[PDB]
Amino acid sequence: QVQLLQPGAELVKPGASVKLSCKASGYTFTSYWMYWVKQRPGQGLEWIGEIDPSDSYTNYNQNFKGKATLTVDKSSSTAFMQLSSLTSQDSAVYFCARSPHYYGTTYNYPMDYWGQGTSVTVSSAKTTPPSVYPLAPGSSVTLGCLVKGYFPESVTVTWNSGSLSSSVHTFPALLQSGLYTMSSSVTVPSSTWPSQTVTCSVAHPASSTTVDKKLEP
Amino acid sequence: DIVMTQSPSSLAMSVGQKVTLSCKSSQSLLNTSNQKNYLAWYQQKPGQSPKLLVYFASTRESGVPDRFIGSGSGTDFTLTISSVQAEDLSDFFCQQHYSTPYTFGGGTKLEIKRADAAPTVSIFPPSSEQLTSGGASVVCFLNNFYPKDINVKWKIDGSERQNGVLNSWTDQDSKDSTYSMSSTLTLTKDEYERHNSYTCEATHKTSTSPIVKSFNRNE
Amino acid sequence: MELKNKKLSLWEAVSMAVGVMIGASIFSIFGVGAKIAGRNLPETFILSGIYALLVAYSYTKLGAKIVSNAGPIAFIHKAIGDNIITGALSILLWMSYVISIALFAKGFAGYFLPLIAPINTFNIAITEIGIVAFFTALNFFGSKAVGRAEFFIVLVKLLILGLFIFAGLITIHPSYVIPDLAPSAVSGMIFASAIFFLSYMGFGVITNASEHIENPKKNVPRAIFISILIVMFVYVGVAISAIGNLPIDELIKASENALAVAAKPFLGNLGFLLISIGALFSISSAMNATIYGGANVAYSLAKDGELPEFFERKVWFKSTEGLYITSALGVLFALLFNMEGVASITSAVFMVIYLFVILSHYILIDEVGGRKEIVIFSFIVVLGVFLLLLYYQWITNRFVFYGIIATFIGVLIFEIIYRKVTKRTFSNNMYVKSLES
């Protein structure tokens, strides 16, 4: 019920800016802090700053002073983080996260509800959708879905609109010649395929793309 | 700034075992009038947002399993996992919620130990729509094995090949605690069609004899 | 995670209101009621209570369906939506607290000096600034501490005034009590009832604390009703004793500490000191409740268009600059006007607030219930009392008349300015459940 909507990915050119959005629902937006958190690949979590959505009071981590600007829009229950003059250092996953306030007290609180995070990628041009190729061949049958030639990250592969999720392997993306390739595997009994249907749905939010592939022998 | 220090770096535990993760702060997190310790614990599964487990040192967040217990005061804190479960595989981060800027520890990685398992190997011919598009890639899935160490041998007509291979390992499985691996041999349509025998050989600690999967282009 | 506010019981809420009511009437404006009402003061308290119960008819009906720390501002927004009327009324509500602080400042000085001192425009201002600034500083060290003592202070002063009643009923002069019948004394009694509308100001502290009260739909209407009846009987029970133990003209002379002197003829100095001490703490707890419970809530509401879901009531929990502004204009009203002035402006501000609440009850009568006949009747009565108060100042102290008229315009003007700059709006978030909770 309580959730924070973040776009999956953002591609931006060096030197440019992004306004990352965090849409709140399920609770009164202005009664809680909004925090923002940076996570680079293979690293820990770094707290960027805070905003009181009621009066737009801000407090920043010194390391991000002049780098990030926090604003809200009260009517739309949306918190924004603007990142300025983007470098290779700024490409990372950025989380928005709720924090209980409790005015007039000495209590500070951690972050209870988080967005899924926006993976920001700082690169020069070339957003491209994926090419999706099916992988079809006793007792169990393994089927696959190949996701090739896409930029930037990331994609999500779902099987039979989510219903098949038990035996699912999501293989991490690898970069080759400026383009990403990843894989997804699913395992079903031999009595459930080729009848009934097995389908991989592949989503690439950076290009607003969704591709379905039915697996057939 | 308050420096947060976590220990140990990583630990490998089998299901049901007990572990104690420690977190240290450079300053006391105890509010002298409140009598409360401003320390939180989080869980981050690979590719997911951090999930709040414990706050104010010892209060479990709603919906969090009883297996997680926080304690300590001042500068020294503890998260006990009394009985690690398959799903618990992740990074565990402590965070002081005492004073801005709020700071996290570097984390403790938990991986699951289990019995050795042999990989299920599946080879896949380049898709019809793949070759009728320019390139051609042969995929080999090695599924549900332990431990994570594994090797794929590609053979073109029975002879070694490793030029256009891409190797990818999944994160540990949150259900059966196994690993899975993807190996992709990418060729040009031209070079793919000038050969017949395509072979994928899987070598794993569980056996000195490699598991072999093959297909011929004329079938 | 789930946060939860510290919630008040019915009697803690009743005590809170009874405290501010007694501190504002018994120990503050009693001297202004001696001059204007005279021997007809017990009737003045009854008549003012009648007005209060007619307003209570609207408050109790609205407060049983509409739960909000915004108080009357929720009722008004549920009725006439968001606009400059609603916005000006929220600032007016904050002003009602501001001017009350001035009223308590004067009342405190009126019992402080005749206890320890000369009485003059400078000495008064010194005692006034000193007590306001102490409560302004109390935010940073002990506003919570005094707040925990409030319930005890109320119980003690009720026993102090309780002995004052029954011990006075042995040494009464029944000839001085008997109600006057002369037109100028009767009209004087009616004119006093207009200034003594503020004597039942418990509406504010209860409704501004309604979301911090256990079972608010039940206990807010009950608190308002029980609280008026307790003080009404206390007012009358005390008023008879004071007049029937000291000549009224001596009470008009010793106005600032009316009840201090009135105890001497039948209790001695042991009684004098008790009433003096009992007065100071009565006003103290009334100020603490008015600033830390009322003014703080009303300020943030007028500033933001909504209130925080979780906050500590007994401190200035948000927008600290407002604490100093509230304290400043609190002195600016105690410097210019005298006790009659402050009291007259207070009642005028409260009546306009009540008038719009009765109007809100009428607009929403299909939702909240009640008889249309009683609502219409209550509106006319309150309107007449308001006009009587304005007519009185027009001829007695025209400076106060302009002081009242300027306030309503100044509040209306500031609202136009504020809504232009900040664009602040009032939303139903004031009374609509937060979905997570």
Domain ranges in chain A? 1-124, 125-214
Give the chain B residue nearest C1 (alpha carbons).
Answer: B61
8 Å CB contact of C2 and B62: yes
| CA dist., res. A77 & res. A75, Å (int) | 6
Contacts of C1 in chain B (CB under 8 A): 52, 55, 61-62
Question: Going by C-beta distance under 8 Å and a sequence separation of 6 or more, which residues neighbour residue A134?
Answer: A143, A144, A145, A146, A200, A213, A214, A215, A216, B127, B129
Q: In the PDB record, what is the listed experimental method?
A: X-ray
Intrachain domains A1-124 and A125-214 with the same fold: yes
8 Å CB contact of B170 and A109: no
CB contact, 8 Å: C1 with chain B?
yes
Q: Hey, what long-range contacts does A48-57 have (CB within 8 A, 24 or more apart)?
A: A48/A81, A48/A94, A50/A99, A50/B100, A51/A79, A52/A101, A53/A29, A53/A79, A54/A30, A54/C304, A54/C306, A54/C308, A55/C304, A55/C319
Q: How many domains, in total, are found in chain C?
A: 1
β-sheet with A179-189: strand ranges across: A131-135, A140-150, A179-189, A168-176
Query: Closest partner residue to C436 among A1, A101, A103, by Cβ?
Result: A1
Q: Which two tokens stand for residue C27?
A: 């120990």
CATH of the domain at C11: 1.20.1740.10
8 Å CB contact of A172 and B133: no
**Smallest Cα–Cα separation from C146: which of C131, C125, C167?**
C131
**Smallest Cα–Cα separation from C320: which of C92, C141, C136?**
C136
| CA dist., res. A15 & res. C422, Å (int) | 33
Range of the domain at C426: 1-437
User: Could you give the residue range(s) of every CATH 2.60.40.10 domain in chain B?
Assistant: 1-114, 115-213
- Give the dihedral sign, CA C227/C232/C237/C242: positive
Query: Closest partner residue to B143 among A142, A146, A170, by Cβ?
Result: A142
**Smallest Cα–Cα separation from C347: which of C295, C388, C303?**
C388
A125-214 has CATH 3.20.20.140 classification: no
| Fold of the domain built from segment(s) A1-124 | Immunoglobulin-like (2.60.40)
| CA dist., res. A152 & res. A13, Å (int) | 12
8 Å CB contact of A31 and C308: yes
**Smallest Cα–Cα separation from B2: which of B34, B36, B33, B37?**
B37
Adjacent-strand bridge partners of B42: B52, B93
Element (H, E) at A144: strand A140-150
Q: Which two tokens stand for residue C78?
A: 């549920």
Contacts of A95 in chain B (CB under 8 A): 49-50
Local structure of C69: helix, strand or coil: coil
Instruction: State the smallest CA–CA distance between residue B139 and chain A in angstroms.
Output: 8
CATH class of B115-213: mainly beta
Q: Where are the alpha helices (DSSP H) in C63-180?
A: 72-80, 84-112, 121-138, 143-168, 174-177
The interaxial angle of helices C143-168 and C216-243, nearest 10 deg, is: 50
Q: Which of B37, B138, B141 to mutate to test the interface with A (most CBs of A within 10 A)?
A: B141
CB C127 within 8 Å of CB C306: no
Adjacent-strand bridge partners of A10: A120
Question: Going by C-beta distance under 8 Å and a sequence separation of 6 or more, which residues neighbour residue A124?
Answer: A13, A14
CB contact, 8 Å: C3 with chain A?
yes
CB contact, 8 Å: C436 with chain B?
no
Adjacent-strand bridge partners of A118: A94
Local structure of B63: helix, strand or coil: coil
Instruction: State the smallest CA–CA distance between residue C436 and chain A in angstroms.
Output: 5
Q: What is the resolution of this structure in A?
A: 2.5
Q: Which two tokens stand for residue B148?
A: 């994570």
Give the chain B residue nearest C2 (alpha carbons).
Answer: B62
Q: Which CATH number fits domain B1-114: 1.20.1440.60, 3.20.20.70, 3.20.20.220, 2.60.40.10?
A: 2.60.40.10
8 Å CB contact of A111 and B50: yes
Q: Which two tokens stand for residue B212?
A: 């072999």
Give me the half-sphere count of Cα atoms (radius 13 Å) on the Cβ side of residue C92.
33
| CA dist., res. A82 & res. B130, Å (int) | 41
CB A79 within 8 Å of CB A96: yes
| CA dist., res. C134 & res. B137, Å (int) | 81
Question: Going by C-beta distance under 8 Å and a sequence separation of 6 or more, which residues neighbour residue A146?
Answer: A132, A133, A134, A135, A181, A183, B127, B130, B137, B139, B184
Going by the DSSP 8-state scheme, the letter that residue A192 receives in this structure is S
CB interface of B with C, residues 153-192, below 8 Å: none
Give me the half-sphere count of Cα atoms (radius 13 Å) on the Cβ side of residue A146.
25
Q: Where are the alpha helices (DSSP H) in C244-293?
A: 248-253, 258-262, 264-267, 269-290
Q: What are phi and psi of B124, to 5 degrees?
A: -135, 125
Give me the half-sphere count of Cα atoms (radius 13 Å) on the Cβ side of residue B87.
4
Local structure of B14: helix, strand or coil: strand
